[PDB]
Swiss-Prot record:
Annotated localization: Cytoplasm
Underlying gene: mnmA
Protein name per UniProt: tRNA-specific 2-thiouridylase MnmA
Region named Interaction with tRNA: 145-147, 223-232, 291-292
Superkingdom field: Bacteria
InterPro entries, per database record: MnmA-like (IPR004506), MnmA-like_C (IPR046885), MnmA-like_central (IPR046884), MnmA-like_central_sf (IPR023382), Rossmann-like_a/b/a_fold (IPR014729)
Residue segments, region Interaction with target base in tRNA: 93-95
Organism in which the protein naturally occurs: Escherichia coli (strain K12)
Length: 348
RNA sequence: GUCCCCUUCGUCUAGAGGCCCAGGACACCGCCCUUUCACGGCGGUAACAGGGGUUCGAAUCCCCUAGGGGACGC
């Protein structure tokens, strides 16, 4: 009877994730992946602590806890890139890669080819649904908690092999079952790799106003960091990063979480992925997410072409950041998405 | 060198003799929110240019010592 390997972080949703499967009658063993080779004694004092919790649980459930080291697949397939997008002055979402490259590939392939597994599972608050012959990626009760956003690259081929159980409950349940079952500095880090190339801050009306320490240290919409005190203008409202001039190492800023140069009408996504691996052409009426936990925003998606897509919002949106992922949903169905290449600014 | 006006938390500033062991804002620090970077919510630190005077009381009044505007310097 079906053996499913559930990766454990020593978390809680991975824990209750295993117990659920087990309770469903699966030969379920656990796997603890290690994707980074420590550098800080501060780092070890964490993984260690996860491993421990990882193990500690598996005992309580009575399942075998395995171990793999994808620390290299990681470095190459997601850390290289990760850094490379900051070089272009973009703001990448490293986790979208960690899933696509590791969690649902490295682990996926391993668990089957080695750990001899029928299915793979994980602590994602997401739901799977095989309908009309093909598996789909869904939200999972309590949309305020859905994490489908990070698994937009997956493919039915992958969805089918995976098993997302915790997504069928309301998150409150999870955290609880776990108890009733007696169970469970970014700026600095970047510096350990990227050199600071200090430039100068300028306002929307081009006015010397501050420095950088780097341009990889800011993202559109980012408030904290600048260090500005307003004067004969500013309306006192805080300052927000509105643009980044990579070529000129110029950081443009503005004022008012509602300033017109922080708003956009749409965007252009490329590096697309549609869960049903069916290429998109034409036009569609769906909804999008520019950043995690961001509320759904209705839109009109126009099949620009090939792999390029033209998304048209229904109301100007906040900080659309090129380099961030764009996920489209059709109800409970996560359809797919791509990486935001261009922002479509507000008509001047 | 002819005589008019400013000088406060990091920043821009309120105050207008006691309500000021000085307020707001932006910054910053912390916490929370969070499977990315952010946003946001909460909270917190910190200042009256120097010297005198007058007052029971001065940030608040006057007085000179320092730093920024006033159609002669022909």
């Amino acid at each position: 009877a079906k053996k499913v390997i559930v990766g454990m972080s020593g978390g809680v949703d991975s824990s209750v994730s295993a117990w659920l499967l087990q309770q469903q009658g699966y030969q379920v063993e656990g796997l603890f992946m290690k994707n980074w080779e420590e550098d800080d004694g501060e780092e070890y004092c964490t993984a260690a602590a996860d491993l421990a919790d990882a193990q500690a649980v598996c005992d309580k459930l009575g399942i075998e806890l395995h171990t793999v080291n994808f620390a290299a697949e990681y470095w190459d397939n997601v850390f290289e890139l990760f850094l490379a997008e900051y070089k272009a002055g973009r703001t990448p979402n490293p986790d979208i890669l960690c899933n696509k490259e590791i969690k649902f590939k490295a682990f996926l392939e391993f668990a089957a080819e080695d750990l001899g597994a029928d299915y793979i599972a994980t602590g994602h608050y997401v739901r799977r649904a095989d309908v009309d012959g093909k598996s789909r990626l869904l939200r999972g009760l309590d949309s305020n908690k859905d994490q489908s956003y990070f698994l937009y690259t997956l493919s039915h081929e992958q969805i089918a092999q995976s098993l997302f159980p915790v997504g069928e409950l309301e998150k409150p349940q999870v955290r609880k079952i776990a108890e009733d079952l007696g169970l469970v500095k970014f700026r600095e880090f970047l510096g350990r790799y990227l050199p600071a190339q200090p430039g100068k801050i300028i306002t929307v009306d081009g006015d010397e106003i501050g420095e950088h320490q780097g341009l990889m240290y800011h993202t559109l919409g980012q408030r904290k960091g600048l260090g500005i005190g307003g004067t004969k203008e500013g309306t006192e409202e805080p300052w927000y990063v509105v643009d980044k001039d990579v070529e000129n190492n110029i950081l443009v800023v503005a004022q008012g979480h509602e300033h017109p140069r922080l708003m956009s009408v749409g965007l252009i996504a490329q590096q697309l992925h549609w869960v049903d691996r069916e290429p998109f052409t034409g036009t569609m009426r769906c909804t999008v997410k520019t950043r995690y936990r961001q509320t759904d925003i209705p839109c009109t998606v126009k099949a620009l072409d090939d792999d390029r897509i033209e998304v048209i919002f229904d109301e100007p949106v906040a900080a659309v950041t090129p380099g961030q992922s764009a996920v489209f949903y059709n109800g409970e169905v996560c359809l797919g998405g791509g990486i935001i290449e261009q922002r479509l600014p507000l008509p001047v």
